[PDB]
Amino acid sequence: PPVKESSFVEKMKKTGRNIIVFYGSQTGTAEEFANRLSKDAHRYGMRGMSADPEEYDLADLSSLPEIDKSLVVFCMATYPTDNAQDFYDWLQETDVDLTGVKFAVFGLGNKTYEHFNAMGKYVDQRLEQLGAQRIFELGLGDDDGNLEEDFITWREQFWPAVCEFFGVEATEESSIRQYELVVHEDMDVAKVYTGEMGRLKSYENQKPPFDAKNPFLAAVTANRKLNQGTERHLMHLELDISDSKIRYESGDHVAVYPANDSALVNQIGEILGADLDVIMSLNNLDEESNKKHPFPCPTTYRTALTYYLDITNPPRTNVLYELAQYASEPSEQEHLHKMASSSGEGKELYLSWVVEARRHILAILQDYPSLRPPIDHLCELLPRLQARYYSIASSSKVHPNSVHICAVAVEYEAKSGRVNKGVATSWLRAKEPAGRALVPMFVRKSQFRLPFKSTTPVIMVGPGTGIAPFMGFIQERAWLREQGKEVGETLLYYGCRRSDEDYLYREELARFHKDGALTQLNVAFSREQAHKVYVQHLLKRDREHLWKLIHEGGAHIYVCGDARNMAKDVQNTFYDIVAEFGPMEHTQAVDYVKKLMTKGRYSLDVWS
Ligand SMILES: Cc1cc2nc3c(=O)[nH]c(=O)nc-3n(C[C@H](O)[C@H](O)[C@H](O)COP(=O)(O)OP(=O)(O)OC[C@H]3O[C@@H](n4cnc5c(N)ncnc54)[C@H](O)[C@@H]3O)c2cc1C
Ligand SMILES: Cc1cc2nc3c(=O)[nH]c(=O)nc-3n(C[C@H](O)[C@H](O)[C@H](O)COP(=O)(O)O)c2cc1C
């Protein structure tokens, strides 16, 4: 387990802080919201700190009242995030009295998902049960609409509520730097970071175990085009994890740390008139903080912009707010300044011109030519470049030393006028098997798993790239049959546009079906006729048999792919099947299916 830092309350006392903001975050959204709230404190005569609850023992919350006008805020996203597990387990377990504790929670969720803001709601509810007093209403941010805006709305009401309760004054301050720039003219190249994530030279000198902090650089042994046509580009990659000691199972995910497009990095440097090869460090102006830098330093701006910073997603409102000061044309400074509005034209412009048009930082620098911020401050403002997850497309029973990836390359026309390229997929696509192509990765254990007993029936639904984990599932069920095991029915419900356009793993699937590994290979070709044909239309077609498998055969259902519409439509079709054959009313059919998920017989691996 992690070695906990010493009491966060004592740390707050020693540094004159009265507010602490904890972040439950997986892809850094809640973390950035916490950082923003922590920084806001200064604007109201207070002082805060942002913190990862995993590095602390939240039992010390009971000591928080020892600090006058103290308050704790929780920015929690749902998936309970890995870093919030300890805190979560603690909440359920303790009977500690948090009398005198003042709190507020802001949840990050997405309605297209089952348990919307479950974590956020739990924390807010539990702290009250334990005796603490809510200082502001629970926030319910929905990433399906616009999370940034929900945060803005909440934040705007939160602070005045806080000032009113503690009797503090709102004042309105000038720009404040979190880090100071230190340029290094003399530096042993052996101490300059070049893209590694953890220890310096950890990419060059690999040492297990390998994880998110110390990714394993896996060699790309294969990278082939899966689709037959040219409308899009879908690919299959095989990463060699030999000698990595990494363990995995069909259903797990593989994460990769990509590199941004070099041309995009070069242009940002060029438009800002900056020398990207300058070696430097951004050092926290708060020498007490454990966050010494915003990213591994010392390093060059080029390396930072390539491996450490997100330069492709639309900049958040606070970033544009802080950049406004560097736009010399009044109208541009005004537009940038107003992006953080909670209503009106400023808000509408942010939603349409930045978010909807998908303008990345370079696009904004190009379209607002008066905006010329210094490179070091920009690097301090940009979010960190995140790893991308993929559903491992292979079975470890068959490929113990290789992790396969099935992915669609992202490349689309943005309303901003440019063609936007997906970071990880463009980078993966360019990896050519060999001075060999290496991909920094690690595996994340999931709960998406084949049944324990070989005899249990399996129903897999995964159109498009949703086929990914099922290639592994099928490889494994085929292996079991080869091993003399008794394997129940294995049905695949797959979907693509046309058999001659993007039928992924066409030959492999035909083989598994021929050999009996697949009991049924049901494929919906959505564009081979005037009307759409989807996997759920095939599920409805086979309702009688599927009900038999589910109700009498104890079958396990698996859905993978599009979380936005496909997953929901498929779930609805299952409701209808249950409703008809139970038989039972729709409401009871829903409870039936929801119960299957709790009992591990209806699993999901969907993304958007
Ligand atoms: C658990 C999990 C499993 C996953 N499994 C797989 C998998 O097995 N195979 C796979 O291909 N992907 C999978 N993904 C998705 C994957 O992690 C990446 O999100 C995806 O590959 C795109 O990454 P990228 O870096 O190439 O694109 P990025 O640079 O990250 O850009 C992605 C963003 O581009 C924007 N965008 C995409 N198209 C448009 C458009 N047409 N118009 C406007 N905006 C658009 C959206 O905001 C999208 O979020 C999975 C994701 C999760 C979370
Ligand atoms: C695999 C996956 C599963 C998710 N499951 C849920 C969920 O059950 N409930 C919910 O409200 N949001 C869910 N979300 C949405 C996130 O909670 C939302 O995007 C949040 O903003 C992410 O914050 P982070 O970057 O700080 O982790 C999911 C997102 C992904 C990618």
Curated annotation (Swiss-Prot):
<comment type="similarity">
    <text>In the N-terminal section; belongs to the flavodoxin family.</text>
</comment>
<keyword id="KW-0285">Flavoprotein</keyword>
<dbReference type="GO" id="GO:0009437">
    <property type="term" value="P:carnitine metabolic process"/>
</dbReference>
<feature type="binding site">
    <location>
        <position position="465"/>
    </location>
    <ligand>
        <name>NADP(+)</name>
    </ligand>
</feature>
<dbReference type="GO" id="GO:0070988">
    <property type="term" value="P:demethylation"/>
</dbReference>
<dbReference type="GO" id="GO:0019395">
    <property type="term" value="P:fatty acid oxidation"/>
</dbReference>
<dbReference type="InterPro" id="IPR039261">
    <property type="entry name" value="FNR_nucleotide-bd"/>
</dbReference>
<feature type="binding site">
    <location>
        <begin position="406"/>
        <end position="408"/>
    </location>
    <ligand>
        <name>FAD</name>
    </ligand>
</feature>
<dbReference type="Pfam" id="PF00175">
    <property type="entry name" value="NAD_binding_1"/>
</dbReference>
<feature type="binding site">
    <location>
        <begin position="388"/>
        <end position="391"/>
    </location>
    <ligand>
        <name>FAD</name>
    </ligand>
</feature>
<dbReference type="GO" id="GO:0050661">
    <property type="term" value="F:NADP binding"/>
</dbReference>
<feature type="binding site">
    <location>
        <begin position="108"/>
        <end position="117"/>
    </location>
    <ligand>
        <name>FMN</name>
    </ligand>
</feature>
<feature type="binding site">
    <location>
        <position position="412"/>
    </location>
    <ligand>
        <name>FAD</name>
    </ligand>
</feature>
<dbReference type="InterPro" id="IPR003097">
    <property type="entry name" value="CysJ-like_FAD-binding"/>
</dbReference>
<dbReference type="InterPro" id="IPR001433">
    <property type="entry name" value="OxRdtase_FAD/NAD-bd"/>
</dbReference>
<comment type="function">
    <text>This enzyme is required for electron transfer from NADP to cytochrome P450 in microsomes. It can also provide electron transfer to heme oxygenase and cytochrome B5.</text>
</comment>
<comment type="similarity">
    <text>Belongs to the NADPH--cytochrome P450 reductase family.</text>
</comment>
<dbReference type="GO" id="GO:0047726">
    <property type="term" value="F:iron-cytochrome-c reductase activity"/>
</dbReference>
<feature type="topological domain" description="Cytoplasmic">
    <location>
        <begin position="1"/>
        <end position="608"/>
    </location>
</feature>
<dbReference type="GO" id="GO:0045880">
    <property type="term" value="P:positive regulation of smoothened signaling pathway"/>
</dbReference>
<dbReference type="InterPro" id="IPR017927">
    <property type="entry name" value="FAD-bd_FR_type"/>
</dbReference>
<dbReference type="GO" id="GO:0016491">
    <property type="term" value="F:oxidoreductase activity"/>
</dbReference>
<dbReference type="GO" id="GO:0019899">
    <property type="term" value="F:enzyme binding"/>
</dbReference>
<dbReference type="GO" id="GO:0009725">
    <property type="term" value="P:response to hormone"/>
</dbReference>
<dbReference type="GO" id="GO:0016787">
    <property type="term" value="F:hydrolase activity"/>
</dbReference>
<dbReference type="InterPro" id="IPR029039">
    <property type="entry name" value="Flavoprotein-like_sf"/>
</dbReference>
<dbReference type="GO" id="GO:0006809">
    <property type="term" value="P:nitric oxide biosynthetic process"/>
</dbReference>
<dbReference type="GO" id="GO:0043231">
    <property type="term" value="C:intracellular membrane-bounded organelle"/>
</dbReference>
<feature type="binding site">
    <location>
        <begin position="422"/>
        <end position="425"/>
    </location>
    <ligand>
        <name>FAD</name>
    </ligand>
</feature>
<protein>
    <recommendedName>
        <fullName>NADPH--cytochrome P450 reductase</fullName>
        <ecNumber>1.6.2.4</ecNumber>
    </recommendedName>
</protein>
<feature type="binding site">
    <location>
        <position position="607"/>
    </location>
    <ligand>
        <name>FAD</name>
    </ligand>
</feature>
<keyword id="KW-0274">FAD</keyword>
<feature type="binding site">
    <location>
        <position position="232"/>
    </location>
    <ligand>
        <name>NADP(+)</name>
    </ligand>
</feature>
<dbReference type="GO" id="GO:0090346">
    <property type="term" value="P:organofluorine metabolic process"/>
</dbReference>
<feature type="binding site">
    <location>
        <position position="143"/>
    </location>
    <ligand>
        <name>FMN</name>
    </ligand>
</feature>
<keyword id="KW-0560">Oxidoreductase</keyword>
<dbReference type="GO" id="GO:0071375">
    <property type="term" value="P:cellular response to peptide hormone stimulus"/>
</dbReference>
<keyword id="KW-0472">Membrane</keyword>
<dbReference type="Pfam" id="PF00667">
    <property type="entry name" value="FAD_binding_1"/>
</dbReference>
<dbReference type="InterPro" id="IPR023208">
    <property type="entry name" value="P450R"/>
</dbReference>
<dbReference type="GO" id="GO:0008941">
    <property type="term" value="F:nitric oxide dioxygenase NAD(P)H activity"/>
</dbReference>
<feature type="domain" description="FAD-binding FR-type">
    <location>
        <begin position="213"/>
        <end position="451"/>
    </location>
</feature>
